[PDB]
Amino acid sequence: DPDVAELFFKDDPEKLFSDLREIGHGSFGAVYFARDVRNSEVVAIKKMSYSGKQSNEKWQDIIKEVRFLQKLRHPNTIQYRGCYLREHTAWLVMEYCLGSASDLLEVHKKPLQEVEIAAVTHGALQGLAYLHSHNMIHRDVKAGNILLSEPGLVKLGDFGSASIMAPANSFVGTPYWMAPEVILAMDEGQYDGKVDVWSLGITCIELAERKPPLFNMNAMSALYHIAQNESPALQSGHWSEYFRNFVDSCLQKIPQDRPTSEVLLKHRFVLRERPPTVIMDLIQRTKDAVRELDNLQYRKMKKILFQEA
Ligand SMILES: Nc1ncnc2c1ncn2[C@@H]1O[C@H](COP(=O)(O)OP(=O)(O)OP(=O)(O)O)[C@@H](O)[C@H]1O
Ligand SMILES: [Ca+2]
Ligand SMILES: [Mg+2]
Ligand SMILES: [Mg+2]
């Protein structure tokens, strides 16, 4: 097969990686914490099976994601380390991140501090401006797809729904985070990288309030709501003016009035001076809490400590 010869390494993954532990579950299989035997380094492995009967589509999705991942070379995007094949299962290897921003919201059962939101937002934004400068669109920006890695960098992950070209016209994304002009393709229409700026605004609210607006409504009704109603905003007046302004700019409903990710890189919310260890401290803050969550042996957050086993 042309695609296997071109995109995959020939090694048997079973010989290269060990101590696999599930750290998540995707659409094609679990995602595992693992150690590369060649250097004792921890990695993340997304196993994607293409057996069964949906084999054709499954294989097609795998290759499409691999081709996208290998194009990426930016510090705020998840590092792709290659892929392997073994018995109808493709092993996509990536640098290992200790958790997602949503895992952080789940561990503390509290929104993040504004300075932490600014740091996470800034990382995700740099990653998005990088994709957009190459005519790509992520299309699924949300806290659950933003990963944190030691020492403390924030990276965009999950390129399963990305577009290699803009403008695009596919109904894709996760309802609560979807931009209005993407929903309007449910019928017909086109859009560009600005749909990610909208999703980033919703994600900012999600980090500030633990959930995106409309999370309390079923997905289908939410879609019509997003398309028809005016934009949501941060609920509380206690956040700084810069943060409130960043979110309101991200959530402009008229696409032409919404700024590109490139322009937002210079927004004061993102450029405001903050401690260079904000993320590191957050991670540590989180590790400490995971070790305290009662039932550490039955935790779904205990993975944040897997590399210590
Ligand atoms: N590089 C990584 N390091 C650590 N954990 C990761 C990594 N990539 C993915 N994960 C974990 O695996 C699960 C994610 O992946 P992805 O977002 O890749 O899944 P999907 O295939 O999009 O599945 P879903 O739709 O359920 O999110 C995530 O929720 C995340 O916790
Ligand atoms: Ca199309
Ligand atoms: Mg995902
Ligand atoms: Mg996905």
Curated annotation (Swiss-Prot):
On the tree of life, the source organism's domain of life is Eukaryota
* Gene (UniProt): Taok2
For staurosporine, which residues are the binding ones? E95, Y96, C97, G144
Q: How is it modified after translation?
A: Autophosphorylated. Phosphorylated by ATM.
List the protein's name.
Serine/threonine-protein kinase TAO2
**Residues at which ATP binds:** I23, G24, H25, G26, S27, F28, G29, A30, V31, K46
> Per the record's keyword annotation, is Nucleotide-binding included, yes or no?
yes
According to its UniProt entry, the function of this protein is described as: Serine/threonine-protein kinase involved in different processes such as membrane blebbing and apoptotic bodies formation DNA damage response and MAPK14/p38 MAPK stress-activated MAPK cascade. Phosphorylates itself, MBP, activated MAPK8, MAP2K3, MAP2K6 and tubulins. Activates the MAPK14/p38 MAPK signaling pathway through the specific activation and phosphorylation of the upstream MAP2K3 and MAP2K6 kinases.
Q: Which GO terms describe its cellular component?
A: actin cytoskeleton; axon; axonal growth cone; cytoplasm; cytoplasmic vesicle; cytoplasmic vesicle membrane; dendritic growth cone; glutamatergic synapse
Q: Please list the residues that carry the modification Phosphoserine.
A: S170
Query: What residues form the catalytic site here?
Result: D140
Entry similarity comment = Belongs to the protein kinase superfamily. STE Ser/Thr protein kinase family. STE20 subfamily.
Subunit text? Self-associates. Interacts with MAP2K3 and MAP2K6. Interacts with tubulins. Interacts with MAP3K7 and interferes with MAP3K7-binding to CHUK and thus prevents NF-kappa-B activation. Isoform 2 interacts with PCDH8; this complex may also include CDH2.
A GO BP annotation:
positive regulation of MAPK cascade
Entry keyword set: ATP-binding, Cell projection, Coiled coil, Cytoplasm, Cytoplasmic vesicle, Cytoskeleton, Kinase, Magnesium, Membrane, Nucleotide-binding, Phosphoprotein, Serine/threonine-protein kinase, Transferase, Transmembrane, Transmembrane helix
Annotated source species? Rattus norvegicus
Q: Where is the Protein kinase domain?
A: 17-270
Entire protein: shown range:
12 to 320 of 1235
Which GO molecular function entries does the Swiss-Prot or TrEMBL record give? ATP binding; MAP kinase kinase kinase activity; mitogen-activated protein kinase kinase binding; neuropilin binding; protein serine kinase activity; protein serine/threonine kinase activity
Localization recorded for this chain is: Cytoplasmic vesicle membrane; Cytoplasm, Cytoskeleton
